[PDB]
RNA sequence: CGAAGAACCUUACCUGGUCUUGACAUCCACGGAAGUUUUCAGAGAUGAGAAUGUGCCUUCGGGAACCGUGAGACAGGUGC
RNA sequence: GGUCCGGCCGGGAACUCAAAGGAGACUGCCAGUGAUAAACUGGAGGAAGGUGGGGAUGACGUCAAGUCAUCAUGGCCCUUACGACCAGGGCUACACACGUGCUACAAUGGCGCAUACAAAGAGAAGCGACCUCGCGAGAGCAAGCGGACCUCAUAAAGUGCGUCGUAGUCCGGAUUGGAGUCUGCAACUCGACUCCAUGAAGUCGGAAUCGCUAGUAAUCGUGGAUCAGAAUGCCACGGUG
């Protein structure tokens, strides 16, 4: 929520969508700076995350708009 | 981190008024959220490592950054000697 | 013609002037009752001057620089005492005997390190 | 501890010039704030006189007779176990220690207001019915009795 | 009410100073102040000159550090010029910024 | 104003009555009491609709409880998911505020157990 | 706790990128004016381009302010 | 002495305030005490009294206790190494404690409008009013201020009139519905805080770790720096008591 008066990005990430958004049927993209907020032009693909024990795939189906990319990464065994 | 970064502060430390803090004095005032012009800000944030204010600082009488007391002008280990030549005028027998 | 004092007690900061005849108590532009209207000490300021028949003889005018009503009740004690202290040298024995000369100065040798009581040295009946 | 300095001097009540009515309130205070506690004690003494229509502050005594003890129990393990021997309280103590049992009865008493928790228990205390008087009579049942075991 | 904040390392050297300003400046106008103090810092000062690391030889000196206030009602040059001609006293300070 | 919703106040005086309505903002109630505006004691029945019907066209775009308790849960839908702002944390059914508050969801989403 | 800020943070450690005169700093050798500004890469260190610029003495000798590349000596840390 | 009711500005030095240089209380004479010793009480005389108090200097000796994490340095240290450059991450889980540190159990209480009085401290990597914008954190203009001038507190109780009726509530912010921003590459599975909607335990629990003797813990509040900066720590003097 501290994204305090409007949107931002990962600056290096969207710079690098640019061939894997060229006919979205393709293999995934990857990111390590999990803070990672993202444009609605990504809709149609797979984007995986450094959790960071391993690298877990998150999925840009039909709705993406509302939270940073951390919301599905399992960082250590939650007892 | 002992000496580290000094060179890269030095390389832009004197021109922050030229990366923003005078460059701003007409174009960037219409770019406020007080004055509304929404296409203008997105071209002046580009300067990244020299966006004012950001300063690694220099502990000087100490050779490596073991803090910096920004009230007194010396490292978080030095203090003892102030009491022994004049630098902290308030340092008598502690109140504790 | 006139006689005077000032005080320092919990935490004020008050003056007082004795004046010729009519017997009243005037704090800046108002009466005693307006300033301590519930404040249970109030008698103690007019008490030692009602002995010496004030009503046709003295008049009392006051002003104050940080109120402090619970402590003022002794700043005024000391002050009004300095005023009578040149009115009539006779009553220094009355002011003392009635406690009206005393002013806050004492702690009863209290704690510095841990012990409660801290001036008195080791005592025995032959060690 | 060789020097005589062992008790507070305090000043008299604002009306009847009595350190009696003054030590009452200054026992009742438990949280500080004096001058409004002193006006509420002054409200106790008027609610008192609603019973009788005269100087019931003279009957303050005729209750305080029953709350004053002669004896108190303090640290005396002398004889290889608890060996009490209370000793009497010096004359100056008889009625301050009675204020101590009037204020512990008032704390949870239950009466409408706190002016009435004190003015009712004084009324009872003259009746010997009282909860301040019951605590004293307990000590008399206890240590004034144990005179015969000392 | 222009506050000339007069200040010397010593009581000695501001006394020598101020008593001429309250004479010189006052001659035709403004009732010139000069004795009225500020929080005079009579402190205890300690420097390490010990010829080896041993116990003490941190010689505790005292100080005076004494400041006063020269005050004038108006910039009346036919009374005040004289203190400004006193520029030659390079051994006392004055801080006139107001 | 023909106030929709669920409950009604029960013979209590205005200044409790008004504020016991199951979703009409309490802190504001201090002032709207004079906007319609009515005495403090009235037991709300004697308002005969007509007395606050005097402010009706406001009330028809205000959140009075019917909205607040169901219809307001639709509101988040263009803000609801993974991406930028406000976000998938709400549609997940979780405790949304406090210290490591995902770990409070025990009761909310199934586990109960430590 | 020492941390009076264990998510740029005075880095323990998990990782990778890199080095072992490192980052800072001298004694001769051969040389140079110092810098402003913008474009594109790279996670950062670092990589590939484009413009504008050229000070003070002054024996035009020697160099300063101040940046290089080659040497031979050669740098460090709460380890108790 | 004038008021256009602001010490406003005329006007003079009681005295606080400010304070520089300083300066005065001694068994000092009186009642009793005993050895006309001894010193202990009450007092004349006071701003304290028999170190007057509150700070303070903490000698050899200090436990073979530390500061072995700036010590100042003898003996000995790792050196493909304990040497130095750089962006990432995750420290906080939870079944268990266990206590420090918190509170929240309704009238010696609060709740609502109205009335009376202080200050310790901080300030140009500053602090910032009036005054513009207000559901407000939070935007902004802009007089000012270098140490009684600018601003933060309009200390809490208390007083006077209203308001519940002993009531799981009106108070409980434990917390979770949605609604907001000051900072940032950066706080989210990591906060810090603002508006509404809330309502976990709630009801006076024993066994036994030592808080606290006097101006001393309840009771009644404020600051400060580390530092691109949120300790609930401590640290220090005030007072209803």
UniProtKB/Swiss-Prot annotation, chain A:
Note whether Ribonucleoprotein occurs among the keywords.
Answer: yes
| Pfam assignment, any one | Ribosomal_S19
Presence of keyword Ribonucleoprotein: yes
| Gene Ontology annotations of biological process type | cytoplasmic translation; ribosomal small subunit assembly
Any single GO molecular-function term of the entry would be:
rRNA binding
State the PROSITE patterns in the record: RIBOSOMAL_S19
Subunit and interaction comment: Part of the 30S ribosomal subunit. Binds S13 and L5 and cross-links to the A site tRNA.
- Family of this protein: Belongs to the universal ribosomal protein uS19 family.
Tell me, in a sentence or two, what this protein's role is.
In the E.coli 70S ribosome in the initiation state it has been modeled to contact the 23S rRNA of the 50S subunit forming part of bridge B1a; this bridge is broken in the model with bound EF-G. The 23S rRNA contact site in bridge B1a is modeled to differ in different ribosomal states, contacting alternately S13 or S19. In the 3.5 angstroms resolved ribosome structures the contacts between L5, S13 and S19 bridge B1b are different, confirming the dynamic nature of this interaction. Bridge B1a is not visible in the crystallized ribosomes due to 23S rRNA disorder. Protein S19 forms a complex with S13 that binds strongly to the 16S ribosomal RNA. Contacts the A site tRNA.
Question: What is the name of the protein in this document?
Answer: Small ribosomal subunit protein uS19
Protein's organism: Escherichia coli (strain K12)
Curated annotation (Swiss-Prot), chain B:
Q: What gene name is given for the protein in this entry?
A: rpsN
Task: Write down the species.
Answer: Escherichia coli (strain K12)
Quaternary structure, per UniProt, is: Part of the 30S ribosomal subunit. Contacts proteins S3 and S10.
Described by its record, this protein's role is as follows: Binds 16S rRNA, required for the assembly of 30S particles and may also be responsible for determining the conformation of the 16S rRNA at the A site.
List all membrane-crossing ranges. Answer: none
Biological processes, Gene Ontology terms: cytoplasmic translation; ribosomal small subunit assembly; translation
| GO MF terms, alphabetically ordered | rRNA binding; structural constituent of ribosome; tRNA binding
- Cross-referenced Gene3D superfamilies, in alphabetical order? 1.10.287.1480
Q: Which GO terms describe its cellular component?
A: cytoplasm; cytosolic small ribosomal subunit; small ribosomal subunit
Question: What name does the UniProt record give this protein?
Answer: Small ribosomal subunit protein uS14
Q: Which Pfam families match?
A: Ribosomal_S14
| Record flagged with keyword Ribosomal protein | yes
UniProtKB/Swiss-Prot annotation, chain E:
A Gene Ontology term for the protein's cellular component: small ribosomal subunit
**What Pfam families has UniProt attached to this entry?**
Ribosomal_S10
Keyword terms of this UniProt record = Ribonucleoprotein, Ribosomal protein, Ribosome biogenesis, RNA-binding, Transcription, Transcription antitermination, Transcription regulation
Q: What SUPFAM superfamilies does the record tag this protein with?
A: Ribosomal protein S10
What family does the entry list?
Answer: Belongs to the universal ribosomal protein uS10 family.
A GO biological process of this protein is: ribosome biogenesis
Functional summary from the UniProt entry: Involved in the binding of tRNA to the ribosomes. Part of the processive rRNA transcription and antitermination complex (rrnTAC). The complex forms an RNA-chaperone ring around the RNA exit tunnel of RNA polymerase (RNAP). It supports rapid transcription and antitermination of rRNA operons, cotranscriptional rRNA folding, and annealing of distal rRNA regions to allow correct ribosome biogenesis. In complex with NusB is involved in the regulation of ribosomal RNA (rRNA) biosynthesis by transcriptional antitermination.
The protein here is known as Small ribosomal subunit protein uS10
What organism, scientifically named, is this protein from?
Escherichia coli (strain K12)
From Swiss-Prot, chain F:
Q: What is this protein called?
A: Small ribosomal subunit protein uS13
Q: Which cysteines are joined by disulfide bonds?
A: none
Cross-referenced Pfam families: Ribosomal_S13 (PF00416)
Keyword terms, alphabetized: Ribonucleoprotein, Ribosomal protein, RNA-binding, rRNA-binding, tRNA-binding
Which sequence ranges are marked TM in the entry?
A: none
GO terms of biological process kind: cytoplasmic translation
Q: Which domain of life is it from?
A: Bacteria
Region annotation (Disordered) ranges: 93-114
Entry's Gene Ontology cellular component terms: cytoplasm; cytosol; cytosolic small ribosomal subunit; small ribosomal subunit
Q: How does it assemble?
A: Part of the 30S ribosomal subunit. Forms a loose heterodimer with protein S19. Cross-links to the P site tRNA and weakly to the A site tRNA. Forms two bridges to the 50S subunit in the 70S ribosome, contacting the 16S rRNA and proteins S19 and L5.
| Consequence when changing residue 104 to K | In PW097; partially suppresses a rimM deletion
Its annotated function is as follows: Located at the top of the head of the 30S subunit, it contacts several helices of the 16S rRNA. In the E.coli 70S ribosome in the initiation state was modeled to contact the 23S rRNA (bridge B1a) and protein L5 of the 50S subunit (bridge B1b), connecting the 2 subunits; bridge B1a is broken in the model with bound EF-G, while the protein-protein contacts between S13 and L5 in B1b change. The 23S rRNA contact site in bridge B1a is modeled to differ in different ribosomal states, contacting alternately S13 or S19. In the two 3.5 angstroms resolved ribosome structures the contacts between L5, S13 and S19 bridge B1b are different, confirming the dynamic nature of this interaction.
Query: How far does the signal peptide extend, from start to end residue?
Result: none
Q: Does this entry carry the keyword Ribosomal protein?
A: yes
